[PDB]
Structure formats: C-alpha cells, structure tokens
Design a protein around this ligand. Structure first.
Ligand SMILES: *[C@@H]1O[C@H](CO)[C@@H](O[C@@H]2O[C@H](CO)[C@@H](O[C@@H]3O[C@H](CO[C@H]4O[C@H](CO)[C@@H](O)[C@H](O[C@H]5O[C@H](CO)[C@@H](O)[C@H](O)[C@@H]5O[C@H]5O[C@H](CO)[C@@H](O)[C@H](O)[C@@H]5O)[C@@H]4O)[C@@H](O)[C@H](O[C@H]4O[C@H](CO)[C@@H](O)[C@H](O)[C@@H]4O[C@H]4O[C@H](CO)[C@@H](O)[C@H](O)[C@@H]4O)[C@@H]3O)[C@H](O)[C@H]2NC(C)=O)[C@H](O)[C@H]1NC(C)=O
Ligand SMILES: CN1CCC(NC(=O)c2ccc(Nc3ncc4c(n3)n(C)c(=O)n4Cc3ccccc3)cc2)CC1
Ligand SMILES: Cn1c(=O)n(C)c2nc(Nc3ccc(Cl)cc3)ncc21
Ligand SMILES: [Ca+2]
Ligand SMILES: [Ca+2]
Ligand SMILES: [Cl-]
Ligand SMILES: [K+]
Ligand code: NA
Ligand SMILES: [Zn+2]
Length: 805
C-alpha cells in the first residue's frame, strides 16, 4: 500500500527514498507504482520541449516549461542545455577544439571533480568506428580523452549481470546476479526482468559504488531511472543536482540509456534502422556536455562513457531445440536463448538424471550449435560456477544462435534480428570504454581490459577505498593522469627449502624402474653446477614465483628446468623452462619409454610411486618439463625424475603430449623463444581459488597423490619479438591456459581425429589470464622483472583471445 495523496512539491527527484506508505518523488517511484499524485505534473514537465529558441531568450520565467531560457535560469540551474548557445552566442561543446585538461578547473566549493557514468545498453565496440560519422560528441570524448579499442564484458553478456559487475567489480557468481532470469533454491524464489521479486535486496550481493561512496561520506545520485522518464529529463535532473549547495550535492552520478540495445534487438547490430538510435544517443551526450559547459563544469567532471555488452545477428530460424535431442523434454526446465541453463522440472522426480541429459546433448549432430557442460567444466576464464543460482547443466551457445526447449516456445511465446548473452570472448559481444576529464589521460589509447576492473578506478576517481572485488587494483593505472593506486607486491608466506643429495637410490621402494645405469671429470663438475642452479637465470626469467600460503616445498634445479616441488601435494606447484627459437625437439628414446627415476634430493616419503599408477587402471602419468625438449641426451634423464611426474588420464595425455611435442616449439619459433611455467591446479569446489588439501576429492588409487582438476601453462616472451625471450629489454607478451584435466575428450567433437585437428582449438577455448592462475594456485608470478609493477599487473590481467580483428 502507498498513500499517494501526499505531494512532490519541492521534492522532485529527491535523493533519499521515503518508505511506504508515504508517497515517493524519486527517480524510481514509477517502477514501484508509488509516485505521489502530482509527480507527472510537477516533476515530468514537457511543455515547450527541450531546447531554447531565439524567441524564448530572456523570456519571463514560466514554471510549467520543461526547461527555461529566462535570465534567472543559470542561478536556478534549470536552463535548457542549449541556452547559452541559442541566447548568449556560445558554441556547443562539440564545436570547440579540445584542449588538454591538466588540472581540474572546478567552481568554488567543489571538494573533488564529480564523476558521471554515462552507460549505454547494447553499444557494440565496433560502433565507435562504424558509426563515427553520426556521433560527433562521442567521437570528441573518445579522441580527446582516454579510450580502449574495446572493453570485455562478463559472462553471460546480458544487461543485469554486466551493469551490476560495473558497479561492484565482481564476477556475477560473486555478486549473485547470474542472469536476467534466476531461480534461487534456498529462497525458493525467482528473479525476473518484469515484476517485483527483483526489488528485494537479497538478490544483490557485494557492495556497489553508490553504497561504497555513501559509507565513506561521498554523496551519490541514484543510478537507476524509471524507463518512462525521457533521456532529456534524466540529463536535466543530473544537471540540477549539480547545482545543489556543496553540502547536499552528489559527487557521483549515473545515466543509463536503453538504446542502442532496444533497436539492435529489432533490427540487428548494423540494420539501417540503427543509425538513428546512434544519432540520438550522441545528441544526449551533447546535451550533457553543453549543460556541463554552461555550469563551468566541462573541465572539472570526469565522464565515463561505457557499454554493458555488444549485439550479434540472431534470428528465429537459427534456434536449436532440445526436443530434437532429448526424449524426456517435459521433465526439464530450460533458461533459453543465447545460453542454456537446465534443471529438473520437479525435485520430486528421482528418475531425472543429469549425466544422461548431458550425454544426449553431446556431439549428436554434425554442426551442433551449442555444447553442454557441467558448470565446473566451463572454461575457468568465464568464472561462472560458484553460485547456487547457476544450474549444474549449462549450454554454451554458438554466436548467432539460440537454444530453446521446443519449437512452440519460439513461435507461441520472426520478431528479432539481434541478441547477446554469448561467451564474453566473442567479438560482437565486446563493448566500449571512454574516460574524459582532468583525472584521465589526454588523447591516449589503452589496450582492451575487462569491465570488472572499472570499480577500482571509479573508487580512485572519487578517493574511495574499494570494497573487496575481482579487479586487480593498479592494473588500470595507465588510464589515469593522477590518483593512481600504488600497490606493493604481496609478501611471500612460505620460504623454499633447497635440498642437496640426501638419499641413496636403494632407500626408495617406489616400484619405478629406469634403464639409466650406464657410466667423467670434465663433465661431473658440470652436472653438479646445474643441480646447484647454474642455468637458473636462463630458465627462471622473471624470478621464482612467490608462494602466498603456508606450505612445505623445495626448489629443484636442473640443466633444462627449475621447479618448486610441494612436499604436501607430492608434485611441483610450478615448473619453469625456457625454449629458444633454435631449440630442437627430440623423441623419448625406446629404452626410456617407461623410465621413472628416484630423486635423491627428495625423501621416498615425499615422492610419488609408480606402483600406484600401475594399480590405478584409470590414471596414468605425464611430465611437467617435457622430455622432448631436453637440451642433450644426458639432460634428458632429469625429465624422468619422479619429482617431474604428475597424474594424467590417458585421454588428457593426448592433449598434453601434443602441447609439449608440437606446440611449445611452434610458439618458440613464432615468438622468438618462450619461457614456459606449467603446473597443476586443484579446484574441486569450483570457486576459482586454490584448494587446501582437505578439499581434494580424488587421489591416484591407493595413494596420497592428489589428482589435479586442471593443468596450466604461462607462456611469456618479448613483446618486441625481434628480441629473444631470454634477452628482452622491454615489455613482455603472454598467453596462458587452464586445461580441464578430464578422463575423456567428450568436450572436443573431433577428438577421434589427429591432435592437429582439435587440440589447439581446445586450448584456445581454455585461454586464461595469469591472474586466474594466481587465484587457482596461491602463486604470484613475475616477481623480478625490469618493468613497473602496474605494468606487470596489466600483463597479469591480459587474456589472449584468439578472435580476429
Ligand atoms: C572475487 O571477489 C570476491 C570478493 O572479495 C571473492 O569472494 C569472497 O571470497 C571469500 C573467500 O571465499 C569470502 O569470505 C568468506 O565470507 C564468509 C562470510 O560471507 C558473508 O559476508 C561477506 C562480507 O560482507 C559477504 O560479502 C558475503 O556475501 C555472499 O553471500 C551472500 C548471501 O549468500 C550473497 O548475497 C553474496 O552475493 C555473496 O555470495 C557469494 O559468496 C559466497 C561465500 O561467502 C558463496 O557461497 C556464493 O556462492 C557467492 O558466490 C556473505 O554474506 C565467511 O563466513 C567465510 O569464512 C569461512 O571460511 C573460513 C576460511 O578462512 C573458515 O576459517 C571459517 O570457519 C568459515 O567456515 C565456516 O563456514 C563454512 C560454510 O558454512 C563451513 O563449511 C565451516 O565448517 C565453517 O563453519 C569466508 O571468509 C567472501 O564472502 C567472498 N565475498 C563475496 C562478495 O563474494 C571471490 O573469491 C573472488 N573470486 C575470485 C575468483 O578471485
Ligand atoms: C527488448 N528489450 C530488452 C531489454 C529490456 N530491458 C531490461 O532488461 C532493463 C531495463 C532497465 C534497466 N536499467 C538499469 N539501470 C541502471 C542499473 C541497472 N539496470 N542495473 C542492473 C544496475 O546495476 N544499474 C546501476 C548502474 C548504472 C550505470 C552503470 C552501472 C550500474 C536495465 C535493464 C526491455 C526490452
Ligand atoms: C599488453 N599486451 C599487448 O598489448 N599485446 C599485443 C599483448 N600480447 C600478449 N601476448 C601475445 C601472445 C601470443 C602472440 Cl603470437 C602475440 C602476443 N600479451 C600481452 C599483450
Ligand atoms: Ca543490456
Ligand atoms: Ca577451490
Ligand atoms: Cl539469463
Ligand atoms: K594406470
Ligand atoms: Na570427443
Ligand atoms: Zn538486450
């Protein structure tokens, strides 16, 4: 109940929302059905439209007008945005040359440059170039300020998850808004775009920027506008708020536009009908900048122009139907469209079986346009699993396609030509970022970055301490002229041991054998030097990784590689080696095919054993440093040490062997040498964070050897590839992956073919940021480079995408 008989007199777009049954006058009252009786009359004036005309100049103030052109309007803060241009001979902001804003030029009373976030729905990255002719204001912001060629959204590339990620710095799995539609089994409640459940604060986790600001004494405009409030009125309202007295005036504001998304759904991303919506958004930007210029705020305010996601061509005819795969389609609930989420229709149906649903959906049709996954098997880069609102069964849908349950859903629920929600690596899903203002750099292009990073920067812009989030604070320092955040590297928690030779061969009873007993002083001093770290500078190029948790581990040196060997997990946490462009690939000699050798530096009690692998009929083993890349026949023996062995399903060994035999050498010739760091990951609770030992769900049979859920590699070289990886003077280049350690290759539909036809495609799907690997391992890489730390943080957030240009 709302007693709508109160009045909005002197309260129009009030900042503190009042509680029922008192009537509301705030920018959200329409959405709640709660505005006072006179809200439209008082607050949503439209008379005479939005622009001054020559004949309105110096008019007598008429309070009925949408905006004003009377002499008193500047001090009332409610002129039409074009007032000074029509009536005082001023120029539009877009018509002025740009001039560097070296310092904030703010009116007296402003304690800090205000921040205005101008968010646009569905604004695909390529619109900046393709629509440039029709967006002069946006183009001026972009060319004069700081811009990226695109900004990566989060998955799913839908509105609610992305706008709330922008506000919180959090992955959707952590903030809880995991789609536009959701079922929470604990609440037993559904969240929908339409209706009232979505207003309940229990859906919305983390701490959004407006709450962060408020808690720290920085006032915020409200970030949500009821859909029927026209854009011109939103802008006018922001500009009025900016004329409040110092003690009442917010420092942070948001504008949101439903366009171009609204039209993009109807006409497709590049439909000829899209030109007008882009012109109209540009006009809105121009109104804001002219309004800021009138208020003398145009060289004071930091403006962020940012999109939530892009838009792809999608039509009704490109729909896969689950009824073409499943016989039991009526026993499931699907969240449909550009992604699929499946659960049981009824919790009382014990006949329902996710394993058989996944199998009926796996590689069933030659050009199948979706791929089923258990959520924990989705590419780790999506960070889309650790939330009870995310169903166990997920469908990754090919770009340009939809999935639906049955054909009747698509014609009894062609309209649309555009949609979005696909994998956030897809080019059509990328969106925009421009920052303009005293705190952003002048005419500066920055590399693409992820939207999870922006919260930290918006907090920096406002002098706020960010709440804990998924950005890497400092990785966007290069966007900013000042207010940088200067982090220090995390402290190492565990120091390594450096074991020497401590055990005789006969102390080991591991069931391992090797044909290696075949007997020099010219060469004996050499092997000793190599075991003491003499080649370490070649193979450990960026210092050893730091271990950021409490554990027992040993550094092991060898001719061709260095490792940090965990006495707790019985295998390396990391293995580091450099492969030059000149390196040769050799084979594993016949006599060494099943060779595993005790490591006399490491006790039998802290070693794996070969018998466990013999006895485990499902599990085999592989090596972290590959024997194929040994530098000499003698060095090759090191690669067969029991301390370089890791457990691997045979199906995964297909993937791993091709990576190690073929791809590493390929990358070394392409990139002019690579440094490789490889290791295991254990994430049995799919939270994106390193498991402790008591979280491990699977061991090699009859042993305490834990089975990794994933294997990673970080492949680093010189950004200037005219320099070899091991003699690089400048910035680095990186690519990484986190490969799921699976007992089948069901994910890869072409896997009965030669690894040259499917392995590299698999690895590209599982591309990763170094930062993802850090979270998953508790390691901190690139500790000793000649680069600035902020630069290394940017490098750690880099994702090599494998999308065209
Ligand atoms: C991305 O960034 C984020 C933000 O930094 C990272 O997420 C953080 O990770 C932390 C480590 O997992 C985690 O810390 C835990 O907090 C528990 C208290 O949680 C509440 O309070 C905070 C603070 O305000 C709040 O943010 C939380 O909000 C979550 O939950 C609400 C309600 O469900 C949601 O609305 C909201 O969206 C958010 O949900 C997300 O996180 C939860 C987990 O907290 C997930 O379950 C959800 O799926 C969702 O993703 C909470 O309201 C605290 O109780 C924990 O302490 C336990 O563990 C310690 C180990 O130190 C142990 O010593 C304790 O004994 C304790 O264990 C006990 O409870 C166990 C479970 O019942 C039980 O098994 C034991 O036997 C013990 O009894 C823990 O410290 C922090 O909450 C989140 N924060 C957020 C916002 O998500 C995220 O990791 C980053 N991602 C990556 C990949 O890096
Ligand atoms: C065919 N059509 C398809 C799309 C349909 N429409 C919708 O689904 C819709 C409507 C209105 C809004 N509005 C909205 N405004 C501000 C938001 C916000 N959502 N969220 C989630 C935030 O966090 N902030 C705060 C903020 C503001 C600015 C930046 C960051 C965060 C969203 C989506 C209509 C039909
Ligand atoms: C910050 N940064 C950047 O601007 N580029 C262009 C980068 N590229 C890479 N990696 C990379 C990897 C494989 C190949 Cl073949 C080429 C480049 N890492 C970091 C990068
Ligand atoms: Ca959207
Ligand atoms: Ca984990
Ligand atoms: Cl959804
Ligand atoms: K075996
Ligand atoms: Na297969
Ligand atoms: Zn949309």
């Amino acid at each position: 109940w709302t007693a709508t008989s109160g009045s909005c007199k002197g309260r129009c777009f009030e900042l503190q929302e009042v509680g029922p049954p008192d009537c509301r006058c705030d920018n959200l009252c329409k959405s709640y059905s709660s505005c006072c009786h006179d809200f439209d009359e008082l607050c949503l004036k439209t008379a005479r439209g939005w622009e001054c005309t020559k004949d309105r100049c110096g008019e007598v103030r008429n309070e009925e007008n949408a905006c004003h052109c009377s002499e008193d309007c500047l001090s009332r803060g409610d002129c039409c945005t074009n007032y000074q241009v029509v009536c005082k001979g001023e120029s539009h902001w877009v018509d002025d040359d740009c001039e560097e804003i070296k310092v904030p030029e703010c009116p007296a009373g402003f304690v800090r440059p205000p921040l205005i976030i101008f968010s646009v729905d569905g604004f695909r990255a390529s619109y900046m170039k393709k629509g440039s002719k029709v967006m002069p204001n946006i183009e001026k912001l972009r060319s004069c300020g700081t811009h990226a060629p695109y900004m990566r959204p989060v998955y799913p590339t839908k509105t609610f998850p992305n706008l709330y990620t922008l506000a919180t710095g959090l992955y959707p799995e952590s903030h809880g808004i995991v789609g536009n539609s959701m079922y929470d089994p604990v609440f037993d409640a559904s969240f929908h775009l339409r209706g009232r459940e979505k207003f309940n604060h229990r859906w919305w986790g983390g701490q959004p920027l407006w709450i962060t600001a408020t808690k720290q004494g920085v006032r915020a405009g409200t970030f949500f506008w009821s859909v029927s409030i026209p854009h011109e009125r939103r802008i006018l309202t922001i500009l009025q708020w900016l004329s409040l007295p110092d003690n009442e005036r917010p420092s942070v504001y948001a504008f949101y536009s439903e366009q171009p998304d609204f039209s993009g759904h109807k006409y497709g991303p590049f439909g000829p009908e899209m030109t007008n919506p882009l012109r109209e958004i540009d006009k809105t930007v121009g109104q804001l900048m002219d309004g800021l210029k009138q208020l003398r705020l145009h060289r004071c305010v930091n403006v962020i122009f940012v999109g939530d996601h892009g838009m792809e061509d999608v039509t009704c005819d490109r729909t896969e139907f689950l009824s073409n795969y499943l016989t039991n389609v009526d026993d499931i609930t699907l969240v449909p469209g550009t992604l699929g989420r499946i659960r049981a229709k009824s919790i009382n149906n014990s006949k329902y079986d996710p394993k058989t649903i996944i199998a009926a959906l796996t590689c069933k049709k030659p050009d199948q346009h979706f791929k089923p996954y258990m959520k924990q098997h989705l590419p780790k880069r999506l960070h889309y699993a650790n939330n009870r609102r995310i169903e166990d069964i997920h469908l990754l849908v090919d770009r340009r396609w939809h999935v639906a349950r049955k054909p009747l859903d698509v014609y009894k629920k062609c309209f649309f030509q555009g949609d979005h929600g696909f994998d956030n690596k897809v080019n059509s899903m990328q969106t925009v970022f421009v920052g303009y203002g005293p705190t952003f750099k002048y005419r500066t292009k920055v590399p693409p970055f992820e939207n999870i990073e922006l919260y930290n920067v918006m907090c920096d812009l406002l002098g706020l301490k960010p709440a804990p989030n998924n950005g890497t604070h400092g990785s966007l320092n290069h966007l900013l002229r000042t207010n940088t955040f200067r982090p220090t590297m995390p402290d190492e928690v565990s120091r390594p041991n450096y074991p020497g030779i401590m055990y005789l061969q006969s102390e080991f009873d591991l069931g391992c054998t090797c044909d290696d007993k075949v007997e020099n002083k010219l060469e004996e001093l050499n092997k000793r030097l190599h075991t003491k770290g003499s080649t370490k500078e070649r193979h450990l190029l960026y210092g050893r990784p730091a271990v950021l948790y409490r554990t027992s581990y040993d550094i092991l040196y060898h001719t061709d590689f260095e490792s940090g060997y965990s006495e707790i997990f019985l295998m390396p946490l990391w293995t580091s080696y450099t492969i030059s462009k000149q390196a040769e690939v050799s084979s594993i000699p016949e006599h060494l095919t099943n060779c595993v050798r005790p490591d006399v530096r490491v006790s039998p009690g802290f070693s794996q054993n070969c018998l466990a692998y013999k006895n485990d009929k499902q599990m085999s083993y592989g090596f972290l440093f590959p024997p194929y890349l040994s530098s000499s026949p003698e060095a090759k023996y090191d690669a067969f040490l029991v301390t370089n062995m890791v457990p691997m399903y045979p199906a995964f060994k297909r993937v791993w062997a091709y990576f190690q035999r073929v791809l590493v050498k390929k990358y070394a010739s392409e990139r002019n040498g690579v440094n490789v760091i490889s290791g295991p990951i254990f994430d049995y609770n799919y939270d994106g964070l390193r498991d402790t030992e008591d979280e491990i769900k699977q061991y090699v049979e009859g042993s305490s050897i834990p089975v990794p859920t994933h294997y990673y590699s970080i492949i680093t070289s010189c950004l200037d590839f005219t320099q070899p990886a091991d003699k690089c003077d400048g910035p680095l280049s990186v690519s990484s992956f986190i490969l799921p350690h699976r007992p089948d290759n069901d994910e890869s539909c072409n896997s009965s073919e030669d690894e040259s036809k499917w392995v590299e495609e698999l690895m590209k799907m599982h591309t990763a940021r170094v930062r993802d690997i850090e979270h998953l391992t508790g390691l901190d890489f690139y500790r000793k480079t000649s680069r600035s730390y902020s630069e290394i943080l940017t490098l750690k957030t880099y994702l090599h995408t494998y999308e065209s240009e």
